[PDB]
Amino acid sequence: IVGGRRARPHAWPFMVSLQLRGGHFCGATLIAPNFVMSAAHCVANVNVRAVRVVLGAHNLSRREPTRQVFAVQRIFENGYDPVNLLNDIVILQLNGSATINANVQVAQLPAQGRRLGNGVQCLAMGWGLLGGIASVLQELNVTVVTSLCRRSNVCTLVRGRQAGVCFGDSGSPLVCNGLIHGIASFVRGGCASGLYPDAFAPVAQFVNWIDSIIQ
Ligand SMILES: CC1=C(C#N)[C@@H](c2ccc(C#N)cc2)N(CC(=O)N2CCN(C(C)C)CC2)C(=O)N1c1cccc(C(F)(F)F)c1
Ligand SMILES: *[C@@H]1O[C@H](CO[C@@H]2O[C@@H](C)[C@@H](O)[C@@H](O)[C@@H]2O)[C@@H](O)[C@H](O)[C@H]1NC(C)=O
Ligand SMILES: *[C@@H]1O[C@H](CO[C@@H]2O[C@@H](C)[C@@H](O)[C@@H](O)[C@@H]2O)[C@@H](O)[C@H](O)[C@H]1NC(C)=O
């Protein structure tokens, strides 16, 4: 996250860090005690039997008793198309269920088909680059835009300055009105161009598919 601020510790207890080889590589969202969702592009080209799913985290450089670590048992994807940057969504089934507490909570999703209009105020978050990787979870006020966005994305822009999501933020949730409306997918013109909206997988188009996977 470029140009944001520290989240309050455990402000977003659905926020997940996917790790490989002791390092964060993508964000994700806990959507049931035993399923996280992320971007398909994050797990394309990775050994998924090696991905560590970290719940309850805040400061990644610190040892945190609040953390709960899971392996991935299985993944599910619906038409992921890297060539057209479409359907950039994956559900990872964990090898167990999270203990649900103050630090670890299931996110709330929109109803299937719910569209966000131009100007809706959201919060993006993640442990991606600050412009230097982030140890502390960052969040950022963003605005939904329909300009320079296709139908197949939710897009957001920080109005008036250069700020947005960056490498390592992929897979992270976009929260609008308490609801997960996007999963961070791609940037244009580099991170925090000041011009191209950030693009998110549009979670609301996938809700019936998500529901049937999680039960
Ligand atoms: C990490 C990354 C890429 C990779 N690997 C990569 C990517 C690949 C596939 C999908 C899908 N479906 C989505 C993104 N990506 C887009 C990207 O690198 N390009 C866009 C497509 N280009 C054409 C000419 C083929 C090549 C360059 C990206 O912005 N990013 C990127 C960079 C910074 C932030 C973010 C995110 F998700 F936080 F927005 C994403
Ligand atoms: C579920 O997985 C947890 C984490 O497993 C660790 O990371 C994975 C990716 C492998 O490298 C594994 O060998 C590591 O231990 C375990 O700590 C936990 O016990 C597992 N839960 C089970 C098996 O019920
Ligand atoms: C910055 O964002 C703060 C939090 O945003 C609200 O809560 C998140 C979880 C989402 O539900 C989002 O849609 C909500 O707007 C706001 O409290 C604060 O007012 C914002 N400030 C500005 C200038 O946008």
Side-chain angles (χ1 to χ4, degrees), residues 33-68:
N34 65 329
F35 293 93
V36 295
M37 75 171 181
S38 197
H41 88 252
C42 282
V43 295
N45 207 30
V46 127
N47 179 11
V48 304
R49 86 192 70 177
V51 170
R52 287 186 174 140
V53 185
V54 187
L55 311 180
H58 186 240
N59 193 336
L60 296 193
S61 76
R62 268 177 165 175
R63 226 184 74 267
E64 296 178 312
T66 58
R67 290 179 177 153
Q68 300 181 31

mmCIF file of all heavy atoms in Angstrom, residues 33-68:
data_model
loop_
_atom_site.group_PDB
_atom_site.id
_atom_site.type_symbol
_atom_site.label_atom_id
_atom_site.label_comp_id
_atom_site.label_asym_id
_atom_site.label_seq_id
_atom_site.Cartn_x
_atom_site.Cartn_y
_atom_site.Cartn_z
ATOM 1 N N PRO A 33 -14.617 -20.302 8.439
ATOM 2 C CA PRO A 33 -13.522 -20.725 9.377
ATOM 3 C C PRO A 33 -12.419 -21.520 8.652
ATOM 4 O O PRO A 33 -11.237 -21.467 9.060
ATOM 5 C CB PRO A 33 -14.277 -21.572 10.418
ATOM 6 C CG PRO A 33 -15.768 -20.890 10.382
ATOM 7 C CD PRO A 33 -15.979 -20.619 8.938
ATOM 8 N N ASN A 34 -12.791 -22.201 7.554
ATOM 9 C CA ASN A 34 -11.868 -23.069 6.799
ATOM 10 C C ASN A 34 -11.671 -22.741 5.297
ATOM 11 O O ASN A 34 -11.164 -23.597 4.509
ATOM 12 C CB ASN A 34 -12.221 -24.567 6.989
ATOM 13 C CG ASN A 34 -13.582 -24.919 6.402
ATOM 14 O OD1 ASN A 34 -14.526 -24.085 6.355
ATOM 15 N ND2 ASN A 34 -13.686 -26.128 5.922
ATOM 16 N N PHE A 35 -11.999 -21.501 4.909
ATOM 17 C CA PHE A 35 -11.753 -21.074 3.511
ATOM 18 C C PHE A 35 -11.269 -19.638 3.484
ATOM 19 O O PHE A 35 -11.794 -18.799 4.238
ATOM 20 C CB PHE A 35 -13.016 -21.178 2.637
ATOM 21 C CG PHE A 35 -13.505 -22.596 2.386
ATOM 22 C CD1 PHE A 35 -14.454 -23.165 3.216
ATOM 23 C CD2 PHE A 35 -13.078 -23.314 1.275
ATOM 24 C CE1 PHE A 35 -14.974 -24.479 2.957
ATOM 25 C CE2 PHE A 35 -13.571 -24.608 1.013
ATOM 26 C CZ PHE A 35 -14.505 -25.181 1.883
ATOM 27 N N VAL A 36 -10.224 -19.368 2.690
ATOM 28 C CA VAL A 36 -9.853 -17.995 2.423
ATOM 29 C C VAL A 36 -10.047 -17.736 0.937
ATOM 30 O O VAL A 36 -10.028 -18.695 0.137
ATOM 31 C CB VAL A 36 -8.376 -17.628 2.823
ATOM 32 C CG1 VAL A 36 -8.159 -17.727 4.343
ATOM 33 C CG2 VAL A 36 -7.355 -18.473 2.081
ATOM 34 N N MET A 37 -10.246 -16.449 0.583
ATOM 35 C CA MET A 37 -10.207 -16.087 -0.803
ATOM 36 C C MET A 37 -9.155 -15.085 -1.146
ATOM 37 O O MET A 37 -8.821 -14.130 -0.376
ATOM 38 C CB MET A 37 -11.587 -15.702 -1.383
ATOM 39 C CG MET A 37 -12.183 -14.412 -1.056
ATOM 40 S SD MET A 37 -13.716 -13.863 -1.967
ATOM 41 C CE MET A 37 -13.686 -12.339 -1.025
ATOM 42 N N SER A 38 -8.678 -15.236 -2.358
ATOM 43 C CA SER A 38 -7.535 -14.446 -2.802
ATOM 44 C C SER A 38 -7.650 -14.259 -4.319
ATOM 45 O O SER A 38 -8.744 -14.489 -4.882
ATOM 46 C CB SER A 38 -6.228 -15.167 -2.387
ATOM 47 O OG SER A 38 -5.129 -14.277 -2.447
ATOM 48 N N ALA A 39 -6.541 -13.822 -4.952
ATOM 49 C CA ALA A 39 -6.444 -13.661 -6.396
ATOM 50 C C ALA A 39 -5.826 -14.939 -6.954
ATOM 51 O O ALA A 39 -4.795 -15.390 -6.423
ATOM 52 C CB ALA A 39 -5.526 -12.456 -6.735
ATOM 53 N N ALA A 40 -6.430 -15.502 -7.998
ATOM 54 C CA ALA A 40 -5.860 -16.672 -8.711
ATOM 55 C C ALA A 40 -4.434 -16.392 -9.132
ATOM 56 O O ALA A 40 -3.600 -17.251 -9.014
ATOM 57 C CB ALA A 40 -6.696 -17.034 -9.930
ATOM 58 N N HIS A 41 -4.134 -15.160 -9.550
ATOM 59 C CA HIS A 41 -2.796 -14.888 -10.048
ATOM 60 C C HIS A 41 -1.733 -15.094 -8.984
ATOM 61 O O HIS A 41 -0.576 -15.332 -9.341
ATOM 62 C CB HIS A 41 -2.662 -13.482 -10.744
ATOM 63 C CG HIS A 41 -2.321 -12.349 -9.811
ATOM 64 N ND1 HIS A 41 -3.225 -11.365 -9.456
ATOM 65 C CD2 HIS A 41 -1.153 -12.026 -9.194
ATOM 66 C CE1 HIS A 41 -2.631 -10.484 -8.661
ATOM 67 N NE2 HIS A 41 -1.365 -10.853 -8.505
ATOM 68 N N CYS A 42 -2.097 -14.959 -7.702
ATOM 69 C CA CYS A 42 -1.151 -15.140 -6.583
ATOM 70 C C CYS A 42 -0.687 -16.578 -6.442
ATOM 71 O O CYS A 42 0.407 -16.842 -5.953
ATOM 72 C CB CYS A 42 -1.878 -14.773 -5.261
ATOM 73 S SG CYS A 42 -2.028 -12.971 -4.958
ATOM 74 N N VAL A 43 -1.549 -17.537 -6.799
ATOM 75 C CA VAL A 43 -1.196 -18.955 -6.547
ATOM 76 C C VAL A 43 -0.889 -19.683 -7.866
ATOM 77 O O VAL A 43 -0.493 -20.847 -7.824
ATOM 78 C CB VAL A 43 -2.281 -19.747 -5.795
ATOM 79 C CG1 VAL A 43 -2.462 -19.208 -4.419
ATOM 80 C CG2 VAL A 43 -3.589 -19.752 -6.596
ATOM 81 N N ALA A 44 -1.046 -19.000 -9.006
ATOM 82 C CA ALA A 44 -0.640 -19.588 -10.263
ATOM 83 C C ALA A 44 0.889 -19.623 -10.076
ATOM 84 O O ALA A 44 1.471 -18.710 -9.453
ATOM 85 C CB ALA A 44 -1.045 -18.705 -11.447
ATOM 86 N N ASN A 45 1.536 -20.654 -10.531
ATOM 87 C CA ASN A 45 3.002 -20.717 -10.329
ATOM 88 C C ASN A 45 3.630 -20.764 -8.921
ATOM 89 O O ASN A 45 4.788 -20.360 -8.711
ATOM 90 C CB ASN A 45 3.812 -19.752 -11.231
ATOM 91 C CG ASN A 45 5.218 -20.283 -11.484
ATOM 92 O OD1 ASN A 45 5.397 -21.519 -11.489
ATOM 93 N ND2 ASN A 45 6.236 -19.384 -11.584
ATOM 94 N N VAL A 46 2.914 -21.349 -7.979
ATOM 95 C CA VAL A 46 3.438 -21.514 -6.646
ATOM 96 C C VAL A 46 3.126 -22.964 -6.278
ATOM 97 O O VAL A 46 2.184 -23.535 -6.795
ATOM 98 C CB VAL A 46 2.740 -20.411 -5.754
ATOM 99 C CG1 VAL A 46 2.080 -20.948 -4.509
ATOM 100 C CG2 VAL A 46 3.644 -19.169 -5.528
ATOM 101 N N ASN A 47 3.919 -23.579 -5.407
ATOM 102 C CA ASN A 47 3.555 -24.900 -4.848
ATOM 103 C C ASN A 47 2.533 -24.696 -3.700
ATOM 104 O O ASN A 47 2.943 -24.273 -2.602
ATOM 105 C CB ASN A 47 4.837 -25.620 -4.315
ATOM 106 C CG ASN A 47 4.551 -27.020 -3.684
ATOM 107 O OD1 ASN A 47 3.439 -27.593 -3.796
ATOM 108 N ND2 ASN A 47 5.591 -27.584 -3.041
ATOM 109 N N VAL A 48 1.242 -24.980 -3.931
ATOM 110 C CA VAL A 48 0.219 -24.600 -2.950
ATOM 111 C C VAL A 48 0.321 -25.418 -1.635
ATOM 112 O O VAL A 48 -0.129 -24.951 -0.571
ATOM 113 C CB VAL A 48 -1.217 -24.571 -3.510
ATOM 114 C CG1 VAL A 48 -1.305 -23.639 -4.722
ATOM 115 C CG2 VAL A 48 -1.699 -25.976 -3.878
ATOM 116 N N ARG A 49 0.940 -26.602 -1.722
ATOM 117 C CA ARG A 49 1.185 -27.468 -0.555
ATOM 118 C C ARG A 49 2.233 -26.810 0.333
ATOM 119 O O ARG A 49 2.475 -27.273 1.425
ATOM 120 C CB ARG A 49 1.547 -28.931 -0.958
ATOM 121 C CG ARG A 49 3.022 -29.190 -1.248
ATOM 122 C CD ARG A 49 3.240 -30.547 -1.909
ATOM 123 N NE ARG A 49 2.739 -30.581 -3.281
ATOM 124 C CZ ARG A 49 2.863 -31.624 -4.097
ATOM 125 N NH1 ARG A 49 3.475 -32.724 -3.681
ATOM 126 N NH2 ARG A 49 2.376 -31.566 -5.328
ATOM 127 N N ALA A 50 2.856 -25.719 -0.130
ATOM 128 C CA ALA A 50 3.841 -25.034 0.689
ATOM 129 C C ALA A 50 3.318 -23.692 1.270
ATOM 130 O O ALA A 50 3.958 -23.086 2.138
ATOM 131 C CB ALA A 50 5.144 -24.834 -0.090
ATOM 132 N N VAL A 51 2.181 -23.212 0.775
ATOM 133 C CA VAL A 51 1.672 -21.878 1.175
ATOM 134 C C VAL A 51 1.224 -21.930 2.625
ATOM 135 O O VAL A 51 0.487 -22.847 3.026
ATOM 136 C CB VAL A 51 0.542 -21.399 0.224
ATOM 137 C CG1 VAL A 51 -0.165 -20.132 0.751
ATOM 138 C CG2 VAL A 51 1.135 -21.170 -1.244
ATOM 139 N N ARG A 52 1.718 -21.002 3.430
ATOM 140 C CA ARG A 52 1.237 -20.905 4.801
ATOM 141 C C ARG A 52 0.192 -19.771 4.899
ATOM 142 O O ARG A 52 0.418 -18.649 4.414
ATOM 143 C CB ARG A 52 2.400 -20.772 5.819
ATOM 144 C CG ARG A 52 3.174 -22.074 6.015
ATOM 145 C CD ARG A 52 4.242 -22.025 7.123
ATOM 146 N NE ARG A 52 4.827 -23.366 7.334
ATOM 147 C CZ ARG A 52 6.120 -23.624 7.566
ATOM 148 N NH1 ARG A 52 7.011 -22.642 7.600
ATOM 149 N NH2 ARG A 52 6.542 -24.878 7.726
ATOM 150 N N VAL A 53 -0.981 -20.096 5.463
ATOM 151 C CA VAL A 53 -2.111 -19.161 5.537
ATOM 152 C C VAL A 53 -2.111 -18.548 6.944
ATOM 153 O O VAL A 53 -2.380 -19.244 7.915
ATOM 154 C CB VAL A 53 -3.495 -19.841 5.221
ATOM 155 C CG1 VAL A 53 -4.584 -18.740 5.211
ATOM 156 C CG2 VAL A 53 -3.462 -20.558 3.847
ATOM 157 N N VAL A 54 -1.759 -17.268 7.052
ATOM 158 C CA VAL A 54 -1.606 -16.637 8.379
ATOM 159 C C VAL A 54 -2.754 -15.726 8.765
ATOM 160 O O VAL A 54 -2.936 -14.629 8.212
ATOM 161 C CB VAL A 54 -0.247 -15.839 8.538
ATOM 162 C CG1 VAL A 54 -0.080 -15.365 9.952
ATOM 163 C CG2 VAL A 54 0.940 -16.721 8.105
ATOM 164 N N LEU A 55 -3.484 -16.159 9.786
ATOM 165 C CA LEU A 55 -4.608 -15.416 10.332
ATOM 166 C C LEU A 55 -4.178 -14.757 11.619
ATOM 167 O O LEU A 55 -3.216 -15.232 12.236
ATOM 168 C CB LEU A 55 -5.744 -16.370 10.670
ATOM 169 C CG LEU A 55 -6.119 -17.361 9.583
ATOM 170 C CD1 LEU A 55 -7.260 -18.207 10.128
ATOM 171 C CD2 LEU A 55 -6.521 -16.673 8.260
ATOM 172 N N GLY A 56 -4.879 -13.665 11.996
ATOM 173 C CA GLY A 56 -4.675 -12.975 13.242
ATOM 174 C C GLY A 56 -3.424 -12.161 13.288
ATOM 175 O O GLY A 56 -2.973 -11.806 14.362
ATOM 176 N N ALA A 57 -2.859 -11.821 12.139
ATOM 177 C CA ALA A 57 -1.572 -11.105 12.133
ATOM 178 C C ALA A 57 -1.751 -9.593 12.131
ATOM 179 O O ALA A 57 -2.770 -9.114 11.626
ATOM 180 C CB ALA A 57 -0.781 -11.531 10.888
ATOM 181 N N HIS A 58 -0.755 -8.839 12.642
ATOM 182 C CA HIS A 58 -0.704 -7.378 12.469
ATOM 183 C C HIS A 58 0.659 -6.907 11.965
ATOM 184 O O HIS A 58 0.813 -6.462 10.796
ATOM 185 C CB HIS A 58 -1.139 -6.621 13.749
ATOM 186 C CG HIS A 58 -1.231 -5.130 13.569
ATOM 187 N ND1 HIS A 58 -0.469 -4.227 14.310
ATOM 188 C CD2 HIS A 58 -1.967 -4.383 12.713
ATOM 189 C CE1 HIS A 58 -0.759 -2.993 13.928
ATOM 190 N NE2 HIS A 58 -1.646 -3.059 12.948
ATOM 191 N N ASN A 59 1.655 -7.026 12.840
ATOM 192 C CA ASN A 59 3.024 -6.741 12.516
ATOM 193 C C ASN A 59 3.778 -8.003 12.077
ATOM 194 O O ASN A 59 4.184 -8.808 12.919
ATOM 195 C CB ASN A 59 3.721 -6.141 13.747
ATOM 196 C CG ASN A 59 5.073 -5.526 13.365
ATOM 197 O OD1 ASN A 59 5.654 -5.925 12.361
ATOM 198 N ND2 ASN A 59 5.527 -4.514 14.103
ATOM 199 N N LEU A 60 4.009 -8.165 10.782
ATOM 200 C CA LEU A 60 4.657 -9.376 10.240
ATOM 201 C C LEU A 60 6.111 -9.609 10.648
ATOM 202 O O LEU A 60 6.610 -10.739 10.555
ATOM 203 C CB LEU A 60 4.517 -9.450 8.722
ATOM 204 C CG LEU A 60 3.071 -9.583 8.178
ATOM 205 C CD1 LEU A 60 3.194 -9.967 6.724
ATOM 206 C CD2 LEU A 60 2.201 -10.600 8.903
ATOM 207 N N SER A 61 6.786 -8.574 11.114
ATOM 208 C CA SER A 61 8.195 -8.719 11.521
ATOM 209 C C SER A 61 8.306 -9.210 12.965
ATOM 210 O O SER A 61 9.405 -9.453 13.431
ATOM 211 C CB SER A 61 8.898 -7.371 11.410
ATOM 212 O OG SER A 61 8.498 -6.562 12.510
ATOM 213 N N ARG A 62 7.166 -9.292 13.667
ATOM 214 C CA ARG A 62 7.105 -9.643 15.096
ATOM 215 C C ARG A 62 6.521 -11.031 15.257
ATOM 216 O O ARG A 62 5.797 -11.512 14.386
ATOM 217 C CB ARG A 62 6.204 -8.674 15.868
ATOM 218 C CG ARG A 62 6.871 -7.453 16.501
ATOM 219 C CD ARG A 62 5.753 -6.626 17.129
ATOM 220 N NE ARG A 62 6.191 -5.596 18.067
ATOM 221 C CZ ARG A 62 5.371 -4.714 18.652
ATOM 222 N NH1 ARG A 62 4.072 -4.730 18.381
ATOM 223 N NH2 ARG A 62 5.853 -3.794 19.503
ATOM 224 N N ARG A 63 6.857 -11.672 16.375
ATOM 225 C CA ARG A 63 6.175 -12.897 16.826
ATOM 226 C C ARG A 63 4.869 -12.427 17.501
ATOM 227 O O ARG A 63 4.879 -11.496 18.334
ATOM 228 C CB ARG A 63 7.077 -13.700 17.806
ATOM 229 C CG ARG A 63 7.152 -15.256 17.533
ATOM 230 C CD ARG A 63 8.005 -16.013 18.630
ATOM 231 N NE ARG A 63 7.268 -16.114 19.909
ATOM 232 C CZ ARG A 63 7.343 -15.243 20.929
ATOM 233 N NH1 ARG A 63 8.156 -14.178 20.873
ATOM 234 N NH2 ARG A 63 6.602 -15.438 22.017
ATOM 235 N N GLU A 64 3.752 -13.026 17.105
ATOM 236 C CA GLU A 64 2.424 -12.582 17.572
ATOM 237 C C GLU A 64 1.687 -13.834 17.998
ATOM 238 O O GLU A 64 1.414 -14.714 17.162
ATOM 239 C CB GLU A 64 1.644 -11.813 16.476
ATOM 240 C CG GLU A 64 2.289 -10.490 16.050
ATOM 241 C CD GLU A 64 1.531 -9.772 14.931
ATOM 242 O OE1 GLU A 64 1.186 -10.434 13.935
ATOM 243 O OE2 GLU A 64 1.290 -8.544 15.035
ATOM 244 N N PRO A 65 1.417 -13.952 19.315
ATOM 245 C CA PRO A 65 0.613 -15.049 19.815
ATOM 246 C C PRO A 65 -0.781 -15.119 19.215
ATOM 247 O O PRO A 65 -1.379 -16.197 19.263
ATOM 248 C CB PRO A 65 0.540 -14.763 21.331
ATOM 249 C CG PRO A 65 1.844 -14.068 21.619
ATOM 250 C CD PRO A 65 2.026 -13.174 20.419
ATOM 251 N N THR A 66 -1.271 -14.022 18.620
ATOM 252 C CA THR A 66 -2.626 -13.944 18.102
ATOM 253 C C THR A 66 -2.815 -14.679 16.768
ATOM 254 O O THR A 66 -3.975 -14.827 16.286
ATOM 255 C CB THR A 66 -3.036 -12.478 17.881
ATOM 256 O OG1 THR A 66 -2.114 -11.846 16.969
ATOM 257 C CG2 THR A 66 -3.005 -11.714 19.220
ATOM 258 N N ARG A 67 -1.686 -15.108 16.190
ATOM 259 C CA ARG A 67 -1.631 -15.728 14.859
ATOM 260 C C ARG A 67 -2.103 -17.173 14.881
ATOM 261 O O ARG A 67 -1.954 -17.875 15.890
ATOM 262 C CB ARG A 67 -0.237 -15.698 14.271
ATOM 263 C CG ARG A 67 0.247 -14.300 13.862
ATOM 264 C CD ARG A 67 1.642 -14.417 13.312
ATOM 265 N NE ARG A 67 2.095 -13.113 12.857
ATOM 266 C CZ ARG A 67 3.368 -12.734 12.795
ATOM 267 N NH1 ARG A 67 4.357 -13.568 13.147
ATOM 268 N NH2 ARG A 67 3.665 -11.501 12.422
ATOM 269 N N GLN A 68 -2.735 -17.576 13.791
ATOM 270 C CA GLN A 68 -3.128 -18.946 13.631
ATOM 271 C C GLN A 68 -2.656 -19.296 12.235
ATOM 272 O O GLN A 68 -2.934 -18.527 11.292
ATOM 273 C CB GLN A 68 -4.650 -19.073 13.723
ATOM 274 C CG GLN A 68 -5.247 -18.606 15.053
ATOM 275 C CD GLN A 68 -6.773 -18.774 15.094
ATOM 276 O OE1 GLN A 68 -7.297 -19.666 14.482
ATOM 277 N NE2 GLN A 68 -7.452 -17.946 15.837
#
